[PDB]
Structure 1
Amino acid sequence: TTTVGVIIPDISNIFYAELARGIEDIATMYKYNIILSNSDQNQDKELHLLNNMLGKQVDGIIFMSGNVTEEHVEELKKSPVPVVLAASIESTNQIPSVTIDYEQAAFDAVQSLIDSGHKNIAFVSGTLEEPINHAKKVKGYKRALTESGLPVRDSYIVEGDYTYDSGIEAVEKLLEEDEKPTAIFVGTDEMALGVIHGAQDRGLNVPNDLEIIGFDNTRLSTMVRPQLTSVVQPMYDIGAVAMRLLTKYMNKETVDSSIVQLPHRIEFRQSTK
């Protein structure tokens, strides 16, 4: 029999949960059994779990993290079972990964506000410590403005903590800079909602005044009013392409493509014109 271990950062986070769930639906069909164990986003419970898992005789692991350190990549470069990352970074492309190009994804998002006429666009990102942000999305945010000639006033990039409440704070701040942004690209659907309500509670209208874009195309995108235009991430595909990938290293049937990049898209709703 075969049992794979799945470890996610925040059991609460609606993106890692829908993802983890999808993987358990796929494992059901593979007849594999899953041992799910939360990480609580702290770098201490992760490695500790990477150890816990082997202490449970797993045959392979699906790994998800906001920040995959070099200390992480090394420890992860010597496991008695295979391992692959689901929607996580490792811009060195050393360990198995199935994600989307956050870089361009973040670029298109901002790119569309430009085209809509927006000169000064803001950006609400998560912990600038996680590479998904400081490395890929921000670069996407800045490459959109710099490439179009528009300036990158660092006063337009505020950090939130993936919380709806930190979303409502980010809006109050950005709605204080003399030059009030006309568009805001948020890196998360949850925060985005906080951005929206925060702007509505100030008497602003989405999107006739402030236009907004979220990330993940999460169930919450269509549970807000106005509906949130968001960057779609191939849910089932990230998990399935990852599990069959893990099945190869588990059956040793090695393949010439260890760094899978699935395509993205943007779901335009009402948060933009």
Structure 2
Amino acid sequence: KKTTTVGVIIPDISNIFYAELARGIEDIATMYKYNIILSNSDQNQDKELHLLNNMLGKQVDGIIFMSGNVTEEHVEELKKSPVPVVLAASIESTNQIPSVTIDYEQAAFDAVQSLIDSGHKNIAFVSGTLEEPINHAKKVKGYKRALTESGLPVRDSYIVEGDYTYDSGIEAVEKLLEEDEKPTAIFVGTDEMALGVIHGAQDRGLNVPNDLEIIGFDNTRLSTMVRPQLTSVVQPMYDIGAVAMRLLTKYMNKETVDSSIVQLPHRIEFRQSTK
């Protein structure tokens, strides 16, 4: 029966974000003696949906799954799964599956409004994948709400969404700054689409926070290796790993789980892309 081995299906562990997430997982699943069967998901409904099955076949006492969009059906096979599943840094409406992640709406919101008081008029959003319920229903959500709630033109084209690259982070700041009405500020999810933006406008001659007051997401090491250093949202890529497994563990080792759905703390880490 129980094999003391917990699979996990993460997108691409080339990705720093997801990287520090292993450590998250790896590091506790060890404390609590379970070999983690890593397995790259490459975000694809069959790559996901299949790969799972096996975690299951090659019997593993649980599964901490991850996606940038844990889909309607997905849940079903997931609700079905004979072994415990604990969605990590991923999200799906129903709460039906435990899920450790950070508070993605409000975090989005805070920086936005905490830009506006920096005497801020025309703000902007630059996130990736507007499909991911992690984006369009969350970081925009907050981007918008703190925005509306303080009467402002929620300009449905003040938001462009390159992938999760630096190159696109500069390339978005361009097509957004091609526009007549130029932005007193900018928001961004991808921690490095922040550099994509700083050395972004900084390449068409424009000082920060001098010309633009920027902010972003994650706070990951990448938020230091820049000039200005980047002022961004703090999310614990690892911490999500940590409290993820501890939680699956709590389920795998019949312990009494408190909240099946968690949201570790989040603060703002202002380096320099903000005054």
1:44 CA displacement? 2.1
For residue 38 of structure 1, what is the aligned residue in structure 2?
Answer: 40
Aligned-partner Cα distance in 2 for 1:221–1:245: 29
Q: How many positions carry a matched residue from both structures?
A: 273
Contact 1:84 1:96 survives alignment (8 Å): yes
Contact 1:168 1:197 survives alignment (8 Å): yes
Identity %: 100
Match of 1:144 among 134, 146, 153: 146
Contact 1:39 1:45 survives alignment (8 Å): yes
Contact 1:11 1:40 survives alignment (8 Å): no
Aligned-partner Cα distance in 2 for 1:199–1:271: 12
Task: Return structure 1 stretches of 4+ with deviation > 6 angstroms.
Answer: none
For residue 191 of structure 1, what is the aligned residue in structure 2?
Answer: 193
Aligned-partner Cα distance in 2 for 1:57–1:225: 49
1:253 CA displacement? 2.7
Once the two structures are superposed, residues 119-168 of structure 1 have per-residue CA deviations (whole angstroms, 9 ceiling, x without a partner) of 11010011111001000110100101100111111120101111111111
Task: Tell me: CA distance 1:40–1:236, structure 2 relative to 1, closer, same or farther (3 Å).
Answer: closer
Aligned-partner Cα distance in 1 for 2:236–2:165: 23
Aligned-partner Cα distance in 1 for 2:114–2:252: 42
Gaps of 5+ in 1: none
Contact 1:59 1:250 survives alignment (8 Å): yes
1:22 CA displacement? 2.3
Which structure has the highest strand share of the two?
A: 1
Contact 1:105 1:140 survives alignment (8 Å): yes
Once the two structures are superposed, residues 176-202 of structure 1 have per-residue CA deviations (whole angstroms, 9 ceiling, x without a partner) of 110111210001112111111121110
Contact 1:6 1:20 survives alignment (8 Å): no
Aligned-partner Cα distance in 2 for 1:234–1:91: 22
Q: Give SS of 2:59's match.
A: coil
TM-score by length of 1: 0.96
For residue 243 of structure 1, what is the aligned residue in structure 2?
Answer: 245
Gaps of 5+ in 2: none
Once the two structures are superposed, residues 57-103 of structure 1 have per-residue CA deviations (whole angstroms, 9 ceiling, x without a partner) of 21111111101111111111111210101111122211110111100
Contact 1:206 1:212 survives alignment (8 Å): yes
1:21 CA displacement? 2.2
Aligned-partner Cα distance in 2 for 1:200–1:236: 31
Higher relative contact order (CA 8 A, sep 6+): 2
